[PDB]
Each structure stands twice: as C-alpha cells, then as structure tokens.
Design a protein around this motif. Structure first.
Motif, PDB file in Angstrom:
ATOM      1  N   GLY A   8       0.853  -1.133  -0.103  1.00 49.72           N
ATOM      2  CA  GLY A   8       0.023   0.090  -0.120  1.00 49.72           C
ATOM      3  C   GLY A   8       0.813   1.361  -0.038  1.00 49.72           C
ATOM      4  O   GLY A   8       0.323   2.112  -0.698  1.00 49.72           O
ATOM      5  N   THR A   9       1.929   1.065   0.702  1.00 48.12           N
ATOM      6  CA  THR A   9       2.724   2.425   0.812  1.00 48.12           C
ATOM      7  C   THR A   9       4.056   2.065   0.357  1.00 48.12           C
ATOM      8  O   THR A   9       5.084   3.050  -0.016  1.00 48.12           O
ATOM      9  N   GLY A  10       4.522   0.934  -0.080  1.00 48.56           N
ATOM     10  CA  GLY A  10       5.757   0.648  -0.526  1.00 48.56           C
ATOM     11  C   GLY A  10       6.534  -0.299   0.246  1.00 48.56           C
ATOM     12  O   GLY A  10       7.735  -0.369  -0.097  1.00 48.56           O
ATOM     13  N   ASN A  11       6.257  -0.494   1.349  1.00 48.45           N
ATOM     14  CA  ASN A  11       7.285  -0.999   2.475  1.00 48.45           C
ATOM     15  C   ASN A  11       7.458  -2.574   2.132  1.00 48.45           C
ATOM     16  O   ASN A  11       8.550  -3.083   2.096  1.00 48.45           O
ATOM     17  N   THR A  12       6.222  -3.372   1.658  1.00 44.36           N
ATOM     18  CA  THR A  12       6.257  -4.583   1.411  1.00 44.36           C
ATOM     19  C   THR A  12       7.163  -5.014  -0.070  1.00 44.36           C
ATOM     20  O   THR A  12       7.597  -5.601  -0.507  1.00 44.36           O
ATOM     21  N   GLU A  13       6.801  -3.635  -0.859  1.00 44.37           N
ATOM     22  CA  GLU A  13       7.399  -3.709  -2.251  1.00 44.37           C
ATOM     23  C   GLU A  13       8.881  -3.543  -2.197  1.00 44.37           C
ATOM     24  O   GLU A  13       9.596  -4.165  -2.783  1.00 44.37           O
ATOM     25  N   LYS A  14       9.239  -2.773  -1.234  1.00 45.50           N
ATOM     26  CA  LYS A  14      10.889  -2.745  -0.885  1.00 45.50           C
ATOM     27  C   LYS A  14      11.523  -4.122  -0.251  1.00 45.50           C
ATOM     28  O   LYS A  14      12.563  -4.515  -0.629  1.00 45.50           O
ATOM     29  N   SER A  54       1.251  -6.669   3.512  1.00 44.85           N
ATOM     30  CA  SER A  54       1.273  -6.246   4.804  1.00 44.85           C
ATOM     31  C   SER A  54       0.142  -6.284   5.454  1.00 44.85           C
ATOM     32  O   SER A  54      -0.737  -7.005   4.712  1.00 44.85           O
ATOM     33  N   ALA A  55       0.263  -6.245   6.735  1.00 42.81           N
ATOM     34  CA  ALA A  55      -0.974  -6.341   7.612  1.00 42.81           C
ATOM     35  C   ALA A  55      -2.062  -5.303   7.225  1.00 42.81           C
ATOM     36  O   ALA A  55      -1.756  -4.017   7.081  1.00 42.81           O
ATOM     37  N   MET A  56      -3.091  -5.538   7.071  1.00 36.25           N
ATOM     38  CA  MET A  56      -4.195  -4.768   6.889  1.00 36.25           C
ATOM     39  C   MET A  56      -5.554  -4.979   7.863  1.00 36.25           C
ATOM     40  O   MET A  56      -5.830  -5.617   8.171  1.00 36.25           O
ATOM     41  N   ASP A  57      -6.253  -3.779   7.606  1.00 33.93           N
ATOM     42  CA  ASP A  57      -7.422  -3.700   8.329  1.00 33.93           C
ATOM     43  C   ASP A  57      -7.231  -3.904   9.933  1.00 33.93           C
ATOM     44  O   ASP A  57      -6.412  -3.344  10.540  1.00 33.93           O
ATOM     45  N   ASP A  58      -7.891  -5.034  10.329  1.00 30.82           N
ATOM     46  CA  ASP A  58      -7.393  -5.401  11.768  1.00 30.82           C
ATOM     47  C   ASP A  58      -6.726  -7.037  11.548  1.00 30.82           C
ATOM     48  O   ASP A  58      -7.448  -8.042  11.726  1.00 30.82           O
ATOM     49  N   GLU A  59      -5.617  -6.852  11.224  1.00 31.08           N
ATOM     50  CA  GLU A  59      -4.674  -8.104  11.175  1.00 31.08           C
ATOM     51  C   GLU A  59      -5.126  -9.162  10.328  1.00 31.08           C
ATOM     52  O   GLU A  59      -5.275 -10.383  10.665  1.00 31.08           O
ATOM     53  N   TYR A  88       4.595  -4.870   8.467  1.00 31.11           N
ATOM     54  CA  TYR A  88       3.391  -4.439   9.382  1.00 31.11           C
ATOM     55  C   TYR A  88       3.975  -3.253  10.350  1.00 31.11           C
ATOM     56  O   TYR A  88       4.841  -2.480  10.157  1.00 31.11           O
ATOM     57  N   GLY A  89       2.808  -2.661  10.901  1.00 32.53           N
ATOM     58  CA  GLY A  89       2.925  -1.352  11.680  1.00 32.53           C
ATOM     59  C   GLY A  89       2.948  -1.427  13.156  1.00 32.53           C
ATOM     60  O   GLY A  89       3.746  -0.867  13.804  1.00 32.53           O
ATOM     61  N   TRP A  90       1.872  -1.858  13.700  1.00 32.71           N
ATOM     62  CA  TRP A  90       1.749  -1.823  15.276  1.00 32.71           C
ATOM     63  C   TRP A  90       1.601  -3.318  16.137  1.00 32.71           C
ATOM     64  O   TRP A  90       1.736  -2.966  17.173  1.00 32.71           O
ATOM     65  N   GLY A  91       1.189  -4.299  15.326  1.00 29.08           N
ATOM     66  CA  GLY A  91       0.821  -5.646  15.929  1.00 29.08           C
ATOM     67  C   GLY A  91       2.134  -6.203  16.402  1.00 29.08           C
ATOM     68  O   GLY A  91       3.211  -5.841  16.167  1.00 29.08           O
ATOM     69  N   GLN A 118       8.862  -4.452  10.349  1.00 32.01           N
ATOM     70  CA  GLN A 118       8.109  -3.392  10.991  1.00 32.01           C
ATOM     71  C   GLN A 118       8.346  -2.146  10.017  1.00 32.01           C
ATOM     72  O   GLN A 118       9.808  -1.831  10.000  1.00 32.01           O
ATOM     73  N   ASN A 119       7.414  -1.460   9.572  1.00 31.46           N
ATOM     74  CA  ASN A 119       7.612  -0.475   8.933  1.00 31.46           C
ATOM     75  C   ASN A 119       8.406  -0.626   7.475  1.00 31.46           C
ATOM     76  O   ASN A 119       8.304  -1.750   7.012  1.00 31.46           O
ATOM     77  N   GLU A 120       9.015   0.393   7.118  1.00 29.99           N
ATOM     78  CA  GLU A 120      10.241   0.327   6.022  1.00 29.99           C
ATOM     79  C   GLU A 120      11.294  -0.643   6.320  1.00 29.99           C
ATOM     80  O   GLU A 120      11.755  -0.445   7.650  1.00 29.99           O
TER      81      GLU A 120
HETATM   82  C1  LIG Z   1      -5.827   0.421   7.199  1.00 26.66           C
HETATM   83  C2  LIG Z   1      -4.655  -0.085   7.618  1.00 26.66           C
HETATM   84  C3  LIG Z   1      -4.764  -1.265   8.490  1.00 26.66           C
HETATM   85  C4  LIG Z   1      -3.633  -1.603   9.088  1.00 26.66           C
HETATM   86  N1  LIG Z   1      -3.610  -2.730   9.804  1.00 26.66           N
HETATM   87  C5  LIG Z   1      -2.518  -3.185  10.618  1.00 26.66           C
HETATM   88  C6  LIG Z   1      -2.741  -4.224  11.645  1.00 26.66           C
HETATM   89  O1  LIG Z   1      -3.942  -4.774  11.889  1.00 26.66           O
HETATM   90  N2  LIG Z   1      -1.564  -4.483  12.254  1.00 26.66           N
HETATM   91  C7  LIG Z   1      -0.203  -3.875  11.937  1.00 26.66           C
HETATM   92  O2  LIG Z   1       0.832  -4.248  12.465  1.00 26.66           O
HETATM   93  N3  LIG Z   1      -0.218  -2.960  11.044  1.00 26.66           N
HETATM   94  C8  LIG Z   1      -1.403  -2.581  10.264  1.00 26.66           C
HETATM   95  N4  LIG Z   1      -1.156  -1.629   9.356  1.00 26.66           N
HETATM   96  C9  LIG Z   1       0.056  -0.836   9.137  1.00 26.66           C
HETATM   97  C10 LIG Z   1       0.877  -1.619   7.782  1.00 26.66           C
HETATM   98  O3  LIG Z   1       0.744  -3.031   7.895  1.00 26.66           O
HETATM   99  C11 LIG Z   1       2.136  -1.027   7.868  1.00 26.66           C
HETATM  100  O4  LIG Z   1       1.948   0.508   7.547  1.00 26.66           O
HETATM  101  C12 LIG Z   1       3.057  -1.615   6.587  1.00 26.66           C
HETATM  102  O5  LIG Z   1       4.558  -0.880   6.948  1.00 26.66           O
HETATM  103  C13 LIG Z   1       2.526  -1.140   5.505  1.00 26.66           C
HETATM  104  O6  LIG Z   1       3.235  -1.786   4.128  1.00 26.66           O
HETATM  105  P1  LIG Z   1       2.844  -1.512   2.881  1.00 26.66           P
HETATM  106  O7  LIG Z   1       3.468  -0.133   2.293  1.00 26.66           O
HETATM  107  O8  LIG Z   1       3.670  -2.630   2.097  1.00 26.66           O
HETATM  108  O9  LIG Z   1       1.394  -1.551   2.737  1.00 26.66           O
HETATM  109  C14 LIG Z   1      -2.260  -1.103   8.839  1.00 26.66           C
HETATM  110  C15 LIG Z   1      -2.175   0.019   7.772  1.00 26.66           C
HETATM  111  C16 LIG Z   1      -3.408   0.396   7.240  1.00 26.66           C
HETATM  112  C17 LIG Z   1      -3.411   1.581   6.326  1.00 26.66           C
END
Ligand SMILES: Cc1cc2nc3c(=O)[nH]c(=O)nc-3n(C[C@H](O)[C@H](O)[C@H](O)COP(=O)(O)O)c2cc1C
Length: 138
Positions: A8-14, A54-59, A88-91, A118-120
């Motif tokens: 979605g933002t390029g972290n998994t792409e990287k 990447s982790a989306m919505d609610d895990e 992933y971001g926060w989980g 986590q993140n980039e």
């Molecule tokens: C709508 C949304 C929901 C997300 N849900 C989760 C989640 O449940 N757990 C987590 O750790 N990160 C979650 N994230 C954070 C992304 O996984 C994280 O920013 C990751 O680096 C995104 O990588 P990407 O650019 O490859 O998409 C979410 C991000 C978005 C935009």
C-alpha cells in the motif's frame, strides 16, 4: 523464480526487491510481480511461490486484491513450497501467523519462517537479502 506481492505504501514492495536481490546474488533469476498484474496460470508452474502482503485492516490480508488471489489459488497449490513475507505497523505479526496457518491448511509446505519487518526495511535490509538467499538455496 517469482515474487508476488501487495503493497500500500511501498514497504512490502521494498522487501520484495531486497528478497529478489538476494536470489539474484545467489546466481538465479527472479521476477517481482504486483498481485494485480499476476497470471495465476504462469505462477502455478513455479516450484516455490514467494508471497508478500502487509498487515491490513484488523490483522488480515489486504481485502480487495491479495485475499481474493489467495482464495483463487488455494485449491491448486497443495504440495507446493511457499515462502511468506510482509511489513506491519503496530501489531506483533498476528496476520502472518494466520497467513502461515492458512497456507499450511491448503496443503502447502512453508519452507522458512515468514519474514516480517516493521515499517520500511531500513535496518532489516540485510535480513531481506538473506531470506532471498535462503529461498534460492532450496
Ligand atoms: C488501514 C490499515 C490497517 C492496518 N492494519 C494493521 C494491523 O492490523 N496490524 C499492523 O501491525 N499494521 C497494520 N497496518 C500498518 C501497515 O501494515 C504498515 O504500515 C506496513 O508497513 C504497510 O506496508 P505496505 O506499504 O507494504 O503496505 C495497517 C495499515 C493500514 C493503512
């Protein structure tokens, strides 16, 4: 080899690019394909499926593109080797524990522990390269 991913933002792409670099450094060729441009048929000829999201919505896996793709190949991948990865971001990796369990449930053999960053990547750049090298050594 083939690396299919959603980002979605390029972290998994990287991460995908770095994993590819590791495979290439090992002397092999590999193509990275965004999930939206993938051809299921050509993909199914591969010995190893390398998938990232990447982790989306609610895990969970991304819903509009990645999830449907997994559902589509699910009945045709029994016995295939798969390597999983994603940012992933926060989980703490719940979406990936589920992803691994799921692939196992479809009959796949998950060749290595899933790589989650986590993140980039940044600090984990070498870890991504090493994951690719491990895959190429299978
Ligand atoms: C709508 C949304 C929901 C997300 N849900 C989760 C989640 O449940 N757990 C987590 O750790 N990160 C979650 N994230 C954070 C992304 O996984 C994280 O920013 C990751 O680096 C995104 O990588 P990407 O650019 O490859 O998409 C979410 C991000 C978005 C935009």
């Amino acid at each position: 080899m083939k690396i299919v991913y959603w980002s979605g933002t390029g972290n998994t792409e990287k991460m995908a690019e770095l994993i590819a670099k590791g495979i290439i450094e090992s002397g092999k060729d590999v193509n990275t394909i965004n999930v939206s441009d993938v051809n299921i048929d050509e993909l199914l000829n591969e010995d190893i499926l390398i998938l990232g999201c990447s982790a989306m919505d609610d895990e969970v896996l991304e819903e509009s593109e990645f999830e449907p793709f997994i559902e589509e190949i699910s009945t045709k991948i029994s016995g295939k080797k798969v390597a999983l990865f994603g940012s992933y971001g926060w989980g703490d990796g719940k979406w990936m524990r589920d992803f691994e369990e799921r692939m196992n449930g479809y009959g796949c053999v998950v060749v290595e522990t899933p790589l989650i960053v986590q993140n980039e990547p940044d600090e984990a750049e070498q870890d991504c390269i090493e994951f690719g090298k491990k895959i190429a050594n299978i």
